[PDB]
Amino acid sequence: SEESELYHAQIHLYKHVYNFVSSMALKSAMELGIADAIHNHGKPMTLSELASSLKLHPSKVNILHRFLRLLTHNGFFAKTIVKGKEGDEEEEIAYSLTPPSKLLISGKPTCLSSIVKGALHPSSLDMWSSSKKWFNEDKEQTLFECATGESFWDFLNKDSESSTLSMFQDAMASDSRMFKLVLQENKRVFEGLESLVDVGGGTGGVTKLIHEIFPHLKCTVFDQPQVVGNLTGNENLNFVGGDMFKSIPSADAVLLKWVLHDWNDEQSLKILKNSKEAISHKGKDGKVIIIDISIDETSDDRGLTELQLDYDLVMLTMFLGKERTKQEWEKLIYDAGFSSYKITPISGFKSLIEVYP
Amino acid sequence: SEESELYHAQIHLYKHVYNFVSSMALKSAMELGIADAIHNHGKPMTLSELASSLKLHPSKVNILHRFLRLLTHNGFFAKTIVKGKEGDEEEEIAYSLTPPSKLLISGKPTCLSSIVKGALHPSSLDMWSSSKKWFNEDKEQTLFECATGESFWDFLNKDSESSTLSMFQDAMASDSRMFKLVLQENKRVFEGLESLVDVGGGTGGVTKLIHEIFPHLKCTVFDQPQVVGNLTGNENLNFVGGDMFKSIPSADAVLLKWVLHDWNDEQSLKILKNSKEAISHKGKDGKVIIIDISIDETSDDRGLTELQLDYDLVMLTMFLGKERTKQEWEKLIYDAGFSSYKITPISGFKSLIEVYP
Numbered sequence: 001s002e003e004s005e006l007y008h009a010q011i012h013l014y015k016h017v018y019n020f021v022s023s024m025a026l027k028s029a030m031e032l033g034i035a036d037a038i039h040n041h042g043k044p045m046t047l048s049e050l051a052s053s054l055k056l057h058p059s060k061v062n063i064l065h066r067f068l069r070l071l072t073h074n075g076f077f078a079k080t081i082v083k084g085k086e087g088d089e090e091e092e093i094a095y096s097l098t099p100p101s102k103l104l105i106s107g108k109p110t111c112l113s114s115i116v117k118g119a120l121h122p123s124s125l126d127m128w129s130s131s132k133k134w135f136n137e138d139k140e141q142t143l144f145e146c147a148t149g150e151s152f153w154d155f156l157n158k159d160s161e162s163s164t165l166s167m168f169q170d171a172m173a174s175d176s177r178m179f180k181l182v183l184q185e186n187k188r189v190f191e192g193l194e195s196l197v198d199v200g201g202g203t204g205g206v207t208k209l210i211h212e213i214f215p216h217l218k219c220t221v222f223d224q225p226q227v228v229g230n231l232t233g234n235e236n237l238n239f240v241g242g243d244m245f246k247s248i249p250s251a252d253a254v255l256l257k258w259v260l261h262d263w264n265d266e267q268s269l270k271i272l273k274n275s276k277e278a279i280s281h282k283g284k285d286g287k288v289i290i291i292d293i294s295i296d297e298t299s300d301d302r303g304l305t306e307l308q309l310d311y312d313l314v315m316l317t318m319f320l321g322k323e324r325t326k327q328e329w330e331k332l333i334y335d336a337g338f339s340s341y342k343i344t345p346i347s348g349f350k351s352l353i354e355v356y357p
Numbered sequence: 358s359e360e361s362e363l364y365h366a367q368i369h370l371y372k373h374v375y376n377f378v379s380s381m382a383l384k385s386a387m388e389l390g391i392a393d394a395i396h397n398h399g400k401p402m403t404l405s406e407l408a409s410s411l412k413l414h415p416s417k418v419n420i421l422h423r424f425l426r427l428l429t430h431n432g433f434f435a436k437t438i439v440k441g442k443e444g445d446e447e448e449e450i451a452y453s454l455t456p457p458s459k460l461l462i463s464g465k466p467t468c469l470s471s472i473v474k475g476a477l478h479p480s481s482l483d484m485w486s487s488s489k490k491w492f493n494e495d496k497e498q499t500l501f502e503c504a505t506g507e508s509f510w511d512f513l514n515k516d517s518e519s520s521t522l523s524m525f526q527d528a529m530a531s532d533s534r535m536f537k538l539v540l541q542e543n544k545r546v547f548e549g550l551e552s553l554v555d556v557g558g559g560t561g562g563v564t565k566l567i568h569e570i571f572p573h574l575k576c577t578v579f580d581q582p583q584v585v586g587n588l589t590g591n592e593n594l595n596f597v598g599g600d601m602f603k604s605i606p607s608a609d610a611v612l613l614k615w616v617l618h619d620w621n622d623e624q625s626l627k628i629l630k631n632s633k634e635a636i637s638h639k640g641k642d643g644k645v646i647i648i649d650i651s652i653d654e655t656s657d658d659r660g661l662t663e664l665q666l667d668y669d670l671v672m673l674t675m676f677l678g679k680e681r682t683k684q685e686w687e688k689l690i691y692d693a694g695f696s697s698y699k700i701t702p703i704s705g706f707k708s709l710i711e712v713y714p
């Protein structure tokens with residue numbers, strides 16, 4: 001027969017069709033403030049208690065229940081049994097948070113809420129209804145532009161989209177501070193360093209975070225003359241204006257945070273070569289630190305690769321941008337003259353790459 | 358520390374945030390006719406060949422590539438290496454279909470295309486932007502009605518939505534014929550039967566499919582007097598008008614296809630009790646066959662449960678409908694007086710339940 005494969009095949013097909021539902025359910029849990037509700041309660045919450053805290057109309061309680069059932073199954077909540085109140089009520093299910101949902105508790109350094117809201121915002125999703133036309137047109141543009149008629153950036157700067165613009169900014173600011181946790185969780189990367197040059201460090205926001213964890217590290221914020229201006233620092237902070245394609249101030253290490261993903265291979269190679277020279281004096285002790293995405297298709301964590309590819313598609317459909325695979329990074333690294341490198345997964349699906357001369 | 362859980366937590370959180378992308382990518386592959394393109398080719402296709410077959414503008418080729426990479430990773434295509442054409446070209450990747458994507462080949466009894474298109478249509482997705490308001494309002498309605506101002510049914514019958522209405526109808530007709538495969542893949546369920554009563558069989562469409570596989574089975578289409586009318590049959594087909602809550606014509610087996618999911622427990626119990634009586638004369642040899650969804654949270658196939666819950670949420674947000682869990686079915690079955698039952702997974706995530714007196 002071999003056609004009896006139909007079932008095993010349908011299952012796989014349907015699971016991918018209805019996956020979107022799990023995202024919408026996560027979106028709902030964060031917009032309803034369920035995490036904060038449970039967190040503020042202080043202990044497992046029952047349906048009714050949660051419903052009361054959310055101030056739901058009675059008819060919306062069973063809806064809350066349904067979403068909860070799915071979210072619980074997806075690991076965003078844990079079910080517990082708690083006896084009712086005053087004899088009559090028997091036993092009730094109580095919901096507790098899990099590591100994933102704790103990332104939804106507002107007012108905390110770990111809150112990824114703004115990113116969940118932004119990633120699943122209509123401005124992120126609605127454009128897909130234009131996907132077929134987008135594939136079949138002759139104009140080269142983002143899916144967002146194809147569906148909207150304008151670039152995402154322009155759309156955001158509209159006055160009628162001010163709130164959306166804030167939301168997006170909240171997502172970035174959140175993505176930026178998430179880097180502090182990256183430093184805290186990977187001190188080993190910076191421990192033996194006496195100096196570090198932050199390429200494209202702009203006005204020093206990133207270096208400031210670096211100093212919040214490594215205050216003795218001599219950091220140099222390197223960027224264009226016009227961006228760094230006359231900016232001054234202190235004993236362990238200085239600003240240098242130049243062109244990274246010509247040279248990079250020397251230091252024990254070169255940090256390239258979200259810098260190379262905006263450049264093609266040719267331009268990225270130059271930057272990496274100037275980075276190797278920037279650490280040459282330190283010999284084999286120097287290192288270059290790259291912070292960008294790295295997709296490893298051979299990884300055994302298929303789910304992670306899928307997530308990385310998923311994000312890659314978002315970059316594609318919204319900005320026509322791209323993320324590199326582990327292999328593309330390896331080629332740049334070796335073509336640049338480096339000897340070895342080490343990839344450390346950070347922030348759920350991003351990467352921290354240590355490159356050695 | 359225990360806070361180092363952040364990464365493991367972020368991964369889980371992000372995967373669920375970006376899951377929707379995998380659905381949109383599947384949607385794109387079906388709207389682009391990639392399956393048919395490869396199928397019609399007859400053998401693994403290269404990027405360019407596929408691009409040529411789809412008649413893509415050169416700028417859209419890398420986009421095709423990206424979607425392909427993600428879809429391949431998700432198991433909808435298999436990568437193969439084929440040498441170029443005429444020396445200069447080296448080796449090129451070639452894409453082959455997989456069981457899942459073969460379900461996308463049009464013009465076949467197994468084509469689930471219409472369902473993919475319908476499930477991921479804007480009319481299915483856009484309403485989610487109204488989810489927060491929906492949870493916080495006092496009006497009891499579907500999410501679709503909350504976002505649109507009208508019921509899905511009314512929306513479909515608009516003249517401006519005629520094509521959408523056709524699409525939806527194509528999805529149902531496709532879901533209906535899929536039942537033929539169900540019969541072919543589960544002949545064992547009907548083999549020892551001499552007679553069968555198709556409750557709510559309407560005008561006999563389902564019975565006709567049943568006769569296409571079991572032509573000697575004496576089938577009785579039972580429905581309301583007004584729906585069955587004076588309709589006549591033949592040796593093995595007859596129509597009987599009545600009220601299933603009062604009684605069901607006797608037969609070796611009672612078929613309840615998509616009948617009980619439209620009734621509450623009270624009403625469903627009556628139907629099941631009348632079904633047990635309809636087969637009483639056949640003694641312990643009789644059986645009742647239920648075709649509806651059954652969600653088993655204790656199942657080891659978490660993915661299947663998630664898909665079932667996902668679908669359940671779709672029913673909820675669009676029709677305010679609901680699907681039963683294995684336990685709810687068990688209670689109805691035993692409350693009805695039956696002794697045992699057996700669940701057989703069908704059509705990716707639906708169920709066929711054999712109930713025994």
Ligand SMILES: Nc1ncnc2c1ncn2[C@@H]1O[C@H](CSCC[C@H](N)C(=O)O)[C@@H](O)[C@H]1O
Nearest residue numbers: 200202206223224227242243244257258259
């Ligand atoms: N020739 C050049 N030399 C140095 N910096 C340059 C440059 N051309 C562009 N840039 C810088 O490229 C930077 C890209 S922003 C990269 C992200 C940043 N390191 C962060 O942590 O957020 C900008 O700050 C821009 O001023």
Ligand SMILES: Nc1ncnc2c1ncn2[C@@H]1O[C@H](CSCC[C@H](N)C(=O)O)[C@@H](O)[C@H]1O
Nearest residue numbers: 557559563580581584599600601614615616
């Ligand atoms: N009292 C009653 N007795 C018998 N059928 C009834 C009924 N009230 C409603 N129905 C029938 O309920 C059916 C629900 S349709 C269920 C799906 C159908 N068996 C299929 O295979 O597609 C309708 O055909 C309707 O006429």
Ligand SMILES: Oc1ccc2c(c1)OC[C@]1(O)c3cc4c(cc3O[C@H]21)OCO4
Nearest residue numbers: 115118119121123124167168171172175
């Ligand atoms: O450096 C970053 C950090 C986070 C995000 C970025 C880029 O873009 C993709 C994204 O999916 C996204 C898309 C959005 C949005 C926020 C948002 O956050 C997510 O608001 C509207 O559209």
Ligand SMILES: Oc1ccc2c(c1)OC[C@]1(O)c3cc4c(cc3O[C@H]21)OCO4
Nearest residue numbers: 472475476478480481524525528529532
């Ligand atoms: O008995 C069935 C069979 C298939 C489907 C049903 C019910 O509803 C949910 C669905 O997700 C769906 C929703 C739709 C659609 C088609 C469609 O198909 C899917 O067209 C517009 O919205």
